[PDB]
């Protein structure tokens, strides 16, 4: 992985040694070049994962997440450089450094072969993320949002640290390849019930699981746009990726420990979808949309079927691009009217016709219009949960209906109707804003032509 | 608007003898 | 153990309680510190003398030397406490609650 780790680090010298007026051009261009080379990770085999060294390996699960992560860095740079224009030069370079360091921790997190190396990097992403939210957020509440984000995560992570170290003691290793062959079954006992909880609660909080999700709408509403992009696109998927790996050693206890969390997700997804119908804040609506989508991922990981794992892998990638696009779309409105109130600026399709096309495409992927990968992921999950229990189609069906209602409600309220009279600073969409939107939707729609590369190890 | 920063009311939360 | 140890250990405990249960005068507590050292001197001297631990016979003497350094240190602080407040009362030394 050094062909990706090292050039990612070299982005830091590049940013700091760039001319004062070229920090965005240089960092954006060279982070796109790194994104290009990440496609070499798709040298995947039918039987064996791609194991580079004792430290790093890349299978079909981590490969698409790595490519999503490295694609997101250039997009985040494009999305931030407007609202950071008045920033002090050094504080602009420190902002970019926080994003580069986040990418560094992320690509190492997704390829760590040892679970305790995964834990440290998994935890290391907190610091740059927290600093972005609290230093470069705009509102007073960004400070409270930082604390909720920090302490929700740590409340779960610290038990996970104890469980992993206990697992290394008893099994002798935490290398994920070794665990595949040395895994022993988990037999019922209160001791194992809490080993199971410690291994899964840290990841449940990151997804987040319904009930434990309150940190997420706070963080999104306060984060800067680049922070919201990485939060929704990648950092949520650290929970999913971690769960997909650790469940290997939790069998067969996962048979009955899953029930309380499937119930929370199946019911929680209807509850958070319905919350979206009455949200007044556009960013908060998108945040609650992520909770509903990630509920499906939690259910799919817990029912442990080949179809559900394929569906979860596609959902994580599809959600990553769609939710990131939606936050970017809402941000472009915010940079004009400087409010997140959804009902404030209406009828924008009249004033920004092409940006209204992006709003349409983003909404269609969010409601999972076939054959988007949003629909492929969501459909595969629904097929597998139906076999788990037929009655789940009722809850899946209702969520699909409510998901369409709030997706098109967001489209209709902001883009259609009459424009707000007194709002007269809706300038024409910039090239930067249109290119940012297209760099989200075009790769998302292109992946429909070749969806096998985002279906994960069980394809 | 512009980014919020602590004002005097906020700063006085940390000027007392105790929190 | 021998019965002498009952009263020497008792004397140490009495002075320890006397030290931990303050009244007003700081001088009174410094006396309880000096008494605690006196019981330790006697208690150590008995053991060493009775066991014929010849080289340990100097140990009680060394104990007194650092007892005086403590008493001198205690009195030095008492002088400063007295100068500040005009009494050696320990209730005056309460500025550092806040």
């Amino acid at each position: 992985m050094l062909k990706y780790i090292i050039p990612t680090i070299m982005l830091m010298p590049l940013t700091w040694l760039s001319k004062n007026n070229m920090i965005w051009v240089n960092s954006t261009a060279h982070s796109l070049l790194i994104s290009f080379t990440s496609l070499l990770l798709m040298n995947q085999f039918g039987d064996n994962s791609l194991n580079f060294s004792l430290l790093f390996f890349s299978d079909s699960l981590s490969t698409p997440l790595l490519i999503l992560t490295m694609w997101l860095l250039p997009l985040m740079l494009m999305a931030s450089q407007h609202h950071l224009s008045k920033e002090n030069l050094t504080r602009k370079k420190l902002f970019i450094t926080m994003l580069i360091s986040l990418q560094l921790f992320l690509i190492m997190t997704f390829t760590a072969m040892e679970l305790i190396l995964f834990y440290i990097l998994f935890e290391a992403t907190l610091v740059p993320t927290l600093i972005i939210i609290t230093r470069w957020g705009n509102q007073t509440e960004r400070l409270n949002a930082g604390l909720y984000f920090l302490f929700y995560t740590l409340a779960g992570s610290l038990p996970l640290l104890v469980a992993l170290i206990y697992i290394q003691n008893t099994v002798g290793s935490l290398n994920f390849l070794m665990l595949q062959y040395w895994v022993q079954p988990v037999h019922n006992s209160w001791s194992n019930v809490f080993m199971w909880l410690a291994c899964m609660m840290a990841f449940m909080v990151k997804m987040p699981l319904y009930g434990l999700h309150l940190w997420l709408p706070k963080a999104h509403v306060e984060a800067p746009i680049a922070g919201s992009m990485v939060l929704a696109a990648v950092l949520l998927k650290l929970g999913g990726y971690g769960m997909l790996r650790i469940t290997l050693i939790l069998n067969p206890m996962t048979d009955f420990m899953a029930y309380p969390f499937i119930m929370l997700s199946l019911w929680g997804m209807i509850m958070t979808s319905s919350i979206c119908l009455r949200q007044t804040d556009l960013k908060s609506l998108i945040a609650y949309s992520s909770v509903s989508h990630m509920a499906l991922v939690i259910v799919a990981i817990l029912i442990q079927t080949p179809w559900s794992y394929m569906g979860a892998t596609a959902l994580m990638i599809a959600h990553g691009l769609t939710s990131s696009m939606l936050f970017c779309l809402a941000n472009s409105n915010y940079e004009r009217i400087h409010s997140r109130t959804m009902i404030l600026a209406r009828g924008l399709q009249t004033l920004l016709p092409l940006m209204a096309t992006w709003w349409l495409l983003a909404s269609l992927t969010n409601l999972a219009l076939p054959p988007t990968i949003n629909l492929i992921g969501e459909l595969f999950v629904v097929m597998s949960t139906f076999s788990w229990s037929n009655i789940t189609i009722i809850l899946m069906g209702v969520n699909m209906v409510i998901t369409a209602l709030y997706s098109l409600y967001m489209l209709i309220m902001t883009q259609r109707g009459k424009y707000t009279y007194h709002i007269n600073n809706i300038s024409p969409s910039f090239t930067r804003e249109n290119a940012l939107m297209s760099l989200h939707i075009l790769p998302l729609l292109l992946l429909t032509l070749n969806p096998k590369i985002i279906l994960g190890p069980l394809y | 608007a512009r980014q919020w920063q602590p004002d005097v009311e906020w700063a006085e939360q940390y000027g007392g003898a105790v929190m | 153990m021998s019965m002498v140890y009952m009263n020497i250990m008792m004397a140490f405990t009495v002075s320890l309680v006397g030290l931990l249960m303050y009244r007003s005068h700081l001088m009174s507590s410094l006396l309880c510190l000096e008494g605690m050292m006196l019981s330790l001197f006697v208690m150590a001297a008995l053991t060493i003398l009775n066991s014929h631990f010849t080289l340990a016979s100097m140990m009680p003497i060394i104990l007194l030397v650092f007892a005086a350094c403590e008493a001198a240190l205690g009195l030095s602080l008492l002088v400063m406490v007295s100068n500040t407040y005009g009494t050696d009362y320990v209730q005056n030394l309460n500025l550092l609650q806040c």
Binding site: N88 | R2, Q5, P6, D7, V8, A11, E12, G15 | -
Partner: protein, 320 residues
């Protein structure tokens, strides 16, 4: 060696450089009372260093290239604005007074550093010991709130305690009616707006509080307007003073060393002039503070530590 404990151990002790002529002298009086001229002549005759009264831009004179800085780098405090509109809503009156005290506190530290390190006495025009008379005049005329006075006293009580008062306090007693005529002759249009009641308040503080206090610990000389017109007679009085009172008798190398470590460290001197007490008159918002601080570092020779600014010709940066 830069001064420090090592230099002191090796023999840099103040008692070696101090003589009978190493004296700190402060000339005080009302506005337009002839302080400057008398102070300059005393300094020239006795062989001392003359410090012109500390103004807004005193600190500028001791750092950088010595020129005044733009007024935003002093808070925009204006003496002219004080004379025109002494009740300005923007708190200019107290902001100026707080700034002036800090400038005097710094000048006093610089003066003490000169006296201790070379043994040459100095002459000052007013000082931190007498600056309060202007604060009393401002408060008695309603130009500042009582809260400003409370703040001023807090800053003074934790700063003036650290220093020794001047050896000699020269005072020129010019009565207010003569002062008003002197201002009218001077010709500064802003200064003509001074009310006589304000001038009387300056005199009441000087006679009421300052001189009675200084008498206990310094040699005080009071000269009428005409006596002050001949500095040679003033110098004669200074040359025959007893010097029998005050804290300077109690000083020793051990104490003057500790005093010298303070005054040479200017940030340590100015530590408590910015106590986190949020008065509207002196509190600055973060956005204003950040912008001005950034502009300050963009000034010539101000980005780096003195001697590391290549924009003004500093050399051997890579070896310094």
């Amino acid at each position: 060696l830069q001064y420090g404990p090592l230099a002191y151990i090796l023999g840099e002790k103040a008692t070696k450089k101090m003589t009978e002529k190493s004296k700190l002298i402060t000339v005080d009086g009302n506005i337009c009372s002839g302080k400057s001229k008398l102070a300059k002549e005393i300094a020239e005759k006795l062989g001392l260093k003359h410090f012109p009264e500390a103004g807004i831009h005193y600190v500028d004179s001791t750092t950088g290239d010595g020129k005044p800085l733009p007024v935003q780098f002093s808070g925009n405090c204006s003496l002219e604005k004080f004379y025109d509109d002494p009740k300005s809503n923007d708190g200019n009156s107290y902001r100026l007074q707080a700034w002036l005290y800090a400038s005097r506190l710094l000048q006093y530290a610089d003066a003490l550093e000169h006296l201790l390190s070379t043994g040459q006495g100095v002459v000052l025009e007013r000082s931190i010991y007498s600056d309060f008379v202007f604060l009393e005049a401002m408060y008695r005329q309603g130009f500042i709130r009582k809260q400003c006075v409370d703040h001023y006293n807090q800053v003074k009580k934790v700063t003036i305690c650290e220093y020794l008062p001047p050896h000699v306090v020269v005072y020129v007693d010019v009565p207010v009616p003569e002062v008003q005529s002197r201002i009218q002759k001077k010709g500064n249009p802003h200064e003509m707006k001074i009310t006589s009641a304000y001038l009387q308040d300056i005199e009441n503080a000087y006679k009421g509080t300052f001189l009675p206090e200084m008498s206990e610990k310094c040699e005080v000389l009071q000269y009428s307007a005409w006596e002050a017109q001949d500095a040679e007679k003033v110098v004669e009085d200074i040359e025959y003073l007893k010097y029998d009172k005050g804290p300077w008798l109690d000083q020793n190398d051990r104490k003057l060393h500790k005093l010298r470590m303070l005054v040479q460290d200017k940030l340590e001197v100015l530590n408590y002039t910015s106590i986190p007490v949020f008065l509207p008159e002196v509190t600055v918002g973060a956005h204003q503070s950040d912008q001005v601080f950034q502009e300050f570092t963009e000034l010539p020779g101000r980005k780096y530590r003195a001697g590391y600014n290549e924009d003004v010709g500093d050399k051997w940066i890579w070896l310094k």
